[PDB]
Ligand binder design. Structure first.
Ligand SMILES: CC(C)(O)[C@H]1N(c2ncnc3[nH]ccc23)CCC1(C)C
Length: 167
């Protein structure tokens, strides 16, 4: 039993909700919140920009030190950093950005990072400003993640379409 509330159950381990991941994180304080990161951990917009804003830019400060030490992530890769005031940890995961021409096949690799954590609060990778089809992202998530994932979908019209079209 966990403290996530109001989710629809899609499969044995995948759950979904119309919610702002920022507000969800502040309520549950999950062990892991997933950020929709880029390889430079520049949290300027989308989910990443919103999460960072909620940390009063502390996420960006920590991220800049991480990049200065380690260099950029790989597309499809991840790193674990602090969750600041939102969660114990933030798993920064880089899904491919279609608006940069990045390979969509890398979306499965991106979701594989979730399997290193027993329970996660997450957005749909590569959706939104990353340019991929959120319906497809949900399919890859369900077919790749085996650990318990609680998906927050910000757009209500999209949440309804994701539910109604889910196979
Ligand atoms: C890009 C995507 C799939 O995560 C969705 N995004 C968010 N999902 C959850 N929590 C959020 N908080 C701030 C943004 C945000 C942004 C727009 C979207 C398409 C509905």
């Amino acid at each position: 039993v966990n403290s996530f509330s109001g989710y629809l159950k899609l499969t044995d381990n995948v759950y979904i909700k119309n919610a702002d991941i920022v507000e969800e994180a502040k309520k549950v304080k999950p062990t892991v919140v997933v950020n929709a990161a880029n390889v430079y951990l520049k949290h300027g917009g989308g989910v990443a920009g919103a999460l960072n804003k909620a940390t009063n830019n502390a996420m960006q400060v920590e991220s800049d030190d991480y990049i200065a030490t380690n260099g950029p992530l790989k597309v499809g890769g991840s790193c674990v950093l602090s969750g600041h005031n939102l969660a114990k940890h933030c798993l920064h995961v880089v899904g491919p950005n279609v608006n940069k021409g990045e390979d969509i096949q890398l979306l499965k690799s991106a979701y594989e990072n979730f399997n290193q954590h027993e329970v996660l609060l997450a957005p749909l990778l590569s959706a939104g400003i990353f340019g991929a089809d959120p319906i497809h992202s949900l399919r890859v998530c369900v077919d790749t993640v085996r650990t318990n994932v609680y998906l927050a979908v910000f757009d209500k019209n999209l949440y309804d379409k994701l539910v109604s079209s889910f196979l």
